[PDB]
Chain length 240, copies 3
């Protein structure tokens, strides 16, 4: 039950908020500094509108983990708790992470992809709060939205993986590893959680997701940031 | 009260999810196939961004009816139930249906119209959960947003009903019949429901709305899809 | 506690809904009338898409105050009550007010600014419902998002305050006074409220916020409307 050693989870949540939140703040600073590695002024002058999704996803996640930190240190149940409804926080963060990939890579069908992940996460929120055997009904519906989304999105990334120069491809390889290697790791964790098989307790479930958000938001956002800097440093700083 | 024969409503909800959800899936397949009846590749190559609203509205509604199916078969009240808050589901579906009309017909004031329907539905959600005599206060406020919206939107459709060729006008006539003939049928049903006059019980209220969503989303979405195909088959496949 | 003389607050809420709601309705009428003071037809023909934020913010606020009026006159606690969760209503209105400034003045970073105010208000909603000493944790996180937002947004406004002619600058001065003089007055009120210091009771807290919304939405929206009319009357009606 809710015997999760909140001081440990509150301390863990505080670290995630600082590192995830701090990483987002750093990315905002780098946005309004230049185009690529060189301090070349932006064509519009301030920054492209679509370059802030990597920074915003970490800032929003860092803020949400700050809310988690308050909830844990408050002793457990709180009127405004992101820990009560699992995957509810990811509803407002995954679209930003996804939009970072779509706009950075110029992947079409940006409207369909965003809806496919929002509904995927909402099915997770509904699956979590359902105490009956129908919790896997919502889970199945979520996978129906997710599997075509991941496979369809993967195909688009492969198409545009070729145009980029080999130097940028190395950075895009590690972004793909996190995006296509860690995102499908959340539904797997659901099956093995206390709601599913039972091999992962709630306290350990929070800790693992804390590390997943570090890679999915901070590490992934920084990789996208440096991929973008490398992309601009080669495309619009000296030609081609 | 809540004596609604959930097995009947769950079975009905399952049919709606498959047909509405399946219709949305079919429309997605047709999008990435060609411009019109002929398999002419799209100008952008994949598809226009605004052609997915018809498909997304049915997919979202089909997913929501899947959630309704779980709620009904679970025995009634569920922690994640779309049946507890009536008209809450339409908040996330009507804008998609409306945006299908606005972008397909290129009707201006797309920002005002979307807000007018979202507030209209929210007043319905508030009107439903209010047990006091003020439930008609929210209903009246909803109609204040709806009547100018329907009349103002109707005027715009009449303006652009003339430019389209007679073959496309026939398809637009039936889209207008559903959009301007069934949408005002929901507020009428509210007055005659158990909350209003009392002539429609809750069980019958769900069944009627199930059929309305079949016409408002599946039939309407398909009519828009074929109107779009007919429009493209005449405008950007052979000239004018 | 909840001894707030609801008939007084309901009567006050009704006045705000009519004046704020009515002002938004008036601004919609002026939009589809002409460009500036003269009745010059719009370049697009109907209206720019970004000119409706001033009208929509008042219409949404007027509608929400109508919901508040029902909640107060119903006797207090209501299933659909905007008065139970303070600052929840501002989540759906402040972005519209902010977007009015951003699009009217063409301030870049429109995506970052909107997120900075939505998270700022959500921290206020969480801060309000928290009964523990951590209510100031959410408040502090909200100020962390707000102070950089207000200072960063202020710098942008100063940059574009110079290009406009002196006649338009006078109208922009009073918009800045409300935007940068009243917005920071809400967090100050939180500290002195019954949740903070204790010098402002809940009944007086509602009355003060009623007057703040009159200036922040109605007066501010009208100033933006006339600033826009003055701007168009000088830029795209006779040249420069
Ligand atoms: C359910 C939660 C889902 C979360 C997703 C929310 C994020 C929404 C994604 C926004 C997509 C916007 C596309 C960005 C790329 C556009 C690039 C561009 O040109 O920008 C257009 C222009 C900026 O550039 P200009 O100054 O015109 O520069 C051109 C001259 N140099 O305006 C824009 O940036 C587009 C609009 C900006 C945002 C408008 C508001 C949209 C909503 C914001 C977030 C709120 C929704 C999330 C709700 C939070 C929970 C309640
Ligand atoms: C309260 C619930 C309300 C529900 C409404 C949500 C739907 C929001 C409507 C989105 C409007 C977008 C306009 C679509 C037409 C634009 C056509 C276009 O050119 O697309 C721009 C470009 C795609 O094309 P490019 O690759 O640039 O192609 C050009 C080169 N060939 O990007 C776009 O599609 C625009 C932005 C895409 C979506 C961005 C995210 C917006 C939010 C998504 C839905 C989430 C909100 C609903 C919340 C769900 C409940 C929590
Ligand atoms: C969490 C609550 C946050 C609230 C914020 C919601 C507001 C979202 C802001 C929308 C930003 C749109 C930018 C407006 C400027 C664009 C100007 C423009 O050219 O418009 C594009 C074109 C209109 O013009 P055309 O007919 O192409 O004219 C060109 C030929 N003369 O389309 C548009 O207006 C852009 C898209 C319109 C809105 C699409 C739907 C977006 C969502 C609407 C609000 C719903 C979200 C709020 C949720 C409410 C709570 C559940
Ligand atoms: C119901 C209307 C919902 C409308 C949306 C409003 C937003 C919700 C804001 C929080 C209000 C919560 C009030 C709950 C009252 C206290 C209940 C409580 O104690 O909490 C839990 C139950 O309630 C919750 O925990 C509800 C938490 C809701 C949190 C949802 C957060 C959504 C915010 C969106 C943010 C978008 C991203 C921006 C970042 C924000 C950073 C702060 C335990 O319940 P008890 O009453 O003790 O009963 C059990 C004891 N026998
Ligand atoms: C309060 C914070 C709200 C913040 C938003 C969070 C989203 C809500 C997700 C569901 C959490 C529900 C937890 C409720 C706990 C159980 C309560 C319950 O049993 O259910 C009902 C009451 O609660 C409900 O039914 C609440 C249902 C909320 C559903 C709202 C769905 C919104 C989702 C948006 C989706 C956007 C579109 C994507 C498609 C999704 C497809 C799955 C009966 O109440 P009891 O406690 O039995 O009391 C009566 C017994 N004497
Ligand atoms: C929980 C799922 C949330 C999902 C979103 C659904 C939207 C919520 C719509 C309102 C449903 C409220 C049902 C609450 C059941 C009654 C509870 C009640 O009596 O009210 C309060 C508690 O509940 C509330 O007050 C919840 C109010 C939620 C209002 C949130 C409004 C959000 C709407 C967004 C609108 C977007 C802008 C458009 C303008 C709309 C204009 C109408 C007092 O509680 P009692 O049960 O008496 O317990 C105390 C007695 N010992
Ligand atoms: C430790 C406390 C202050 C929180 C710091 C969190 C953020 C701000 C820190 C954590 C790790 C940091 C990154 C570590 C390594 C690099 C590589 C270097 O070539 C550029 C800076 C960059 C990308 C750093 C930016 C700042 C960073 C993202
Ligand atoms: C493949 C796509 C198109 C269809 C997806 C159908 C999914 C949602 C269906 C297939 C089998 C179904 C499950 C079959 C049996 C049960 C047992 C019951 O006591 C609870 C519901 C539950 C667990 C069902 C939930 C819904 C379910 C998982
Ligand atoms: C559990 C996790 C960490 C490991 C799984 C990582 C997976 C997702 C990684 C490992 C190898 C990667 C692939 C390596 C090569 C290519 C070819 C390129 O043209 C498109 C991307 C694509 C197809 C990558 C997609 C992501 C990928 C499949
Ligand atoms: C019965 C089960 C499989 C659910 C099927 C639901 C969806 C996929 C079905 C229901 C009715 C079907 C439509 C029936 C008639 C036509 C007209 C034809 O000229 C093109 C296909 C089209 C438009 C069909 C597409 C698929 C469709 C929309
Ligand atoms: C026409 C526009 C601009 C104004 C709309 C005003 C509407 C919202 C007003 C007009 C008359 C009002 C009703 C008058 C009397 C009552 C009885 C009371 O016990 C509950 C509220 C209720 C039912 C009111 C709700 C609000 C109401 C319906
Ligand atoms: C109860 C329902 C099914 C029947 C009511 C259907 C109504 C909404 C239908 C019946 C006839 C239709 C009208 C027929 C002709 C025109 C002229 C055209 O230039 C614009 C659309 C317009 C104005 C239609 C709007 C929709 C309409 C009024
Ligand atoms: C009193 C009742 C009807 C509610 C009226 C509310 C709205 C519609 C009223 C309140 C104050 C009014 C404004 C008062 C002064 C002016 C200045 C004038 O040069 C143009 C009209 C304008 C801008 C008015 C427009 C209508 C207005 C905004
Ligand atoms: C400046 C930025 C980057 C960091 C902001 C840190 C804020 C959120 C920190 C600084 C000091 C903290 C407070 C320190 C002590 C307490 C007492 C405790 O019983 C409740 C929480 C509370 C009230 C903390 C809430 C969070 C807090 C306000
Ligand atoms: C409590 C409230 C009502 C009074 C405080 C009003 C403040 C916010 C007002 C008073 C004077 C105003 C400043 C007057 C002059 C300028 C210079 C211009 O180039 C940019 C705006 C700017 C910088 C204004 C910003 C808003 C401002 C600082
Ligand atoms: C930073 C957080 C991220 C990137 C979270 C991603 C989460 C998912 C891809 C979750 C997917 C799920 C499904 C496929 C179905 C079942 C429920 C979920 C929510 C675990
Ligand atoms: C697929 C579902 C659709 C198209 C639903 C449409 C619903 C409406 C137009 C509802 C309108 C209402 C009002 C006019 C006021 C009172 C409340 C409503 C919600 C019934
Ligand atoms: C019409 C209403 C408006 C313009 C409301 C504006 C509200 C704010 C700027 C609120 C700000 C807050 C913070 C800075 C932190 C603490 C909580 C708030 C919500 C009071
Ligand atoms: Na957000
Ligand atoms: Na994936
Ligand atoms: Na990727
Ligand atoms: Na949705
Ligand atoms: Na209508
Ligand atoms: Na129509
Ligand atoms: Na709204
Ligand atoms: Na400010
Ligand atoms: Na301003």
């Amino acid at each position: 039950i809710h015997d999760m050693d909140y001081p440990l989870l509150g301390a863990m949540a505080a670290i995630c908020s600082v590192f995830i939140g701090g990483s987002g703040a750093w990315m905002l600073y780098r946005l309004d500094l230049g185009l690529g590695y060189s301090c070349k002024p932006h064509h519009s002058g301030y920054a492209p509108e679509a370059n802030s999704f990597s920074a915003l996803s970490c800032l929003v996640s860092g803020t949400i983990y700050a809310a988690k930190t308050f909830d844990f240190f408050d002793g457990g149940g709180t009127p405004f708790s992101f820990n009560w409804y699992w995957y509810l926080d990811y509803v407002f963060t995954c679209p930003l992470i996804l939009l970072d990939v779509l706009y950075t890579l110029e992947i079409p069908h940006k409207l369909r992809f965003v809806f496919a992940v929002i509904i995927t996460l909402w099915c997770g929120v509904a699956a979590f709060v359902t105490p009956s055997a129908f919790r896997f009904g919502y889970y199945a519906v979520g996978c129906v939205w997710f599997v075509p989304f991941s496979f369809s999105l993967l195909r688009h990334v492969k198409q545009r993986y070729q145009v980029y120069p080999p130097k940028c491809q190395k950075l895009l390889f590690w972004a793909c590893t996190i995006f296509f290697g860690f995102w499908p790791l959340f539904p797997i964790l659901f099956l093995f959680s206390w709601l599913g098989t039972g091999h992962i307790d709630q306290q350990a479930f929070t800790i693992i997701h804390a590390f997943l958000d570090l890679f999915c938001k901070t590490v992934f956002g920084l990789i996208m940031t440096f991929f973008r800097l490398e992309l601009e440093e080669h495309t619009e700083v000296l030609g081609l």
